[model samples]
Target: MKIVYWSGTGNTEKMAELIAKGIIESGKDVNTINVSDVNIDELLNEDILILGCSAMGDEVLEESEFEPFIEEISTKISGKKVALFGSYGWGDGKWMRDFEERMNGYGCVVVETPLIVQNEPDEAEQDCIEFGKKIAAI
Candidate 1:
């Protein structure tokens, strides 16, 4: 499995590191890298996608880069397996729900629930890591 993420600090980016650690610990190959480094073919061909974004404008996907990347791949990613993760500041994960819904509409089979964590993820951290391990099933 390959994971791509946006932004660092306070931090949506760190989850990628944590999750990929679990993936490796679970006896699977993994790469947690920036979205810009990932080719569409990698995401499209792979069975599991690990995507993370920070809640930047009112609990929404990162607009300039991450969101557009998602839009760009919508058609190709249809019918793919996925795991969505993100860091949120406030509110009850409306961003994740909406993103998950959008993925569903794109014919994506999301892996279990989309992973979400707030600014401080002392408790949420373990779940996020486990989610990555779980995706090895894909």
Candidate 2:
């Protein structure tokens, strides 16, 4: 499994780490890396790909970086297993829902409901871990 993510205020980064921790606990191989550091080829090599990002600019993906990376790999993920996680500041998790739909449209076998944190994830740690474990099991 490869966990690729982008973090603006360190919120989503922490989420990625927590998810990685759970994956490790499941005794699975996992690499948690930044989106900028990952190539589309790297994503294609993973049995499971987990993407994390924060919502920015009107309930959308952090466009300057994450959106472009996701778009580049989105079309290549057909039949691949994938999952999503993220944090948001001022919206009702519309960004995650939209992203989930987009992945579905791409024919990716997106498993698990996207794990979304309201802000800093102070109360969402356990949820993140459990979500990670669940996905790793898949």
Candidate 3:
């Protein structure tokens, strides 16, 4: 499994690390990559493709390097087990829902509903961690 993530203020990056930890603890081989540095070819072959990106203006995806990076591989996301997670400080958390739905429409099996943390992930982050384990099992 590979967890490819893009983080702005370290929130999603931390989540990515935590998810990778959960995967390792479950005895699964895991690879975590910053979306900026991810290799599209490698992503296409991953058993699981986890996307982590904080919500930006107008309830949208990150606007910088990360989104562009994802754009480069969006078409290849199909047929892969995919999931979304991120932090939301303001506005509704509709961005993740829309993103997940788009992925589903693209033929990607969404392993879990989008996990949106308000501001920062606290105890509830355990849910994301456990979700990682559960996804690893699948």
Candidate 4:
């Protein structure tokens, strides 16, 4: 499994790390890449999509690279299982909820619940890891 993510203050990246740890413990090999470095075609038509991006600009996705990436990938990611995650400082988790709905609209199945950290992931390590195990089980 591969995780593609974008982090501004590293909280989401840390969540990715813990989730990967859980996947490893569950006997699945996983790798994570910063979304900026991900080639457009690298994740097309994959079995699972593990994507993380922090909430920005009115509880929406990061509007620059990550948004465009999602826009392009939506064309071919239909019928894939996706897990969405992010970190936010303010607002109720409207961002994550909207993201989940959007993935569902893309015809992707989101397995289990997603992980969201408030600011830093200091208290969310175990939760993040467990989320990964849930992901690997699928």
Candidate 5:
């Protein structure tokens, strides 16, 4: 599994790390990288993809980086296994909903319910770990 993510305040970064740790715990190879550093070709070579991005500006993806990356990778995701996760300051997780729809429209099989955290409080740690384990199990 390759987990790529973009985080502005470090919240999502920590979440990605914990998730990656869980994947490693499950004995699977996992690569976690920031969206800015990811090579597009790397995405095509992976069997499972996990993407994370925080919601910005009224429940939308971080446009400057994540959105553009998604636009480029969207078409390549057909028939691929994927999972979505992120953090949000407010709103009803609308960003995740739209993202899920977009991934589904691309013919990707979404692995599980998106893990959305509000500011990555201590309570969210277990959820993030469990999400990683769940994705790794697939």
Candidate 6:
């Protein structure tokens, strides 16, 4: 499993780390990396890909590493098992919705609806952890 994540304001980073922790606890091989640090080829090698980012603007992935990386990888996502997660401060969590929809449109099987955090994670983080396990099952 590879958790490819991008963070702004550090909230989503924390979520990614926590999800990685759960993945480790499951005794599965897991790699958590920034989107910019990942290679496009690595996506093919990964059994499960979990993408995390923070909401920005009117339903956009963060304008940093994640945006460009997704722009490239999104094209190759069909037939792959994928999942989405992110942090949010405002709005209706539309960014995550759009992100997931894009992946779905590409024929990627989203393992979950998306683990969304408003501000920072608390008890809801357990959902993300379990979501990680579910993606591994995929």
Model 5: runs farther than 4 Å from truth? none
Model 5 C-alpha lDDT per residue in residues 89-116, reported as the tens digit of each score: 8687999999999899999999899999
Q: In each prediction, how many residue pairs overlap at the backbone (N, C-alpha, C within less than 3 A)?
A: 0, 0, 0, 0, 0, 0
In the predicted model 3, the residue pairs found to clash are none
lDDT of 4 by residue, 1-138 (tens): 889998988988998898899999999898898998987676764578899998888999998788988998987877888999888998778999999999899888888787888887887889999999999988
lDDT of 3 by residue, 1-138 (tens): 888887878888888887888788899888888887888887788777788888888888888876787677778777878878887787668888888877888788998877777766777678768878877788
Q: Which stretches of candidate 2 lie over 4 Å from their true place?
A: none
Report per-prediction Cα RMSD to one decimal. 1.4, 0.9, 1.4, 1.1, 0.9, 1.5
What is the Cα-based TM-score of model 2?
0.96
Summing lDDT over every window of 10 consecutive residues in candidate 2, give the lowest-scoring window. 39-48
Highest lDDT: which candidate? 5
Candidate 1 structure quality by residue, lDDT tens digits, 1-138:
789888757477778888887888889888777877878876777878788887778878888788989999998877788889888886789988999999999999987788888885677778777887788755
Which runs of model 1 end up more than 4 angstroms from their true locations? 8-10
- The ten-residue window of minimal lDDT in model 3 covers 119-128
* Model 4 misplaced regions, further than 4 Å: none
Output the lDDT of residue 27, model 1: 92
> What TM-score should be assigned to candidate 5?
0.96
Q: Estimate, for each residue in 19-116, the C-alpha lDDT of model 6 and write its tens digit.
A: 88777778888888888788789766776678999998777988867888887877777888887899888777889889988888878888777988
lDDT score, candidate 5, position 89? 82
Local lDDT at 75 for model 3: 82
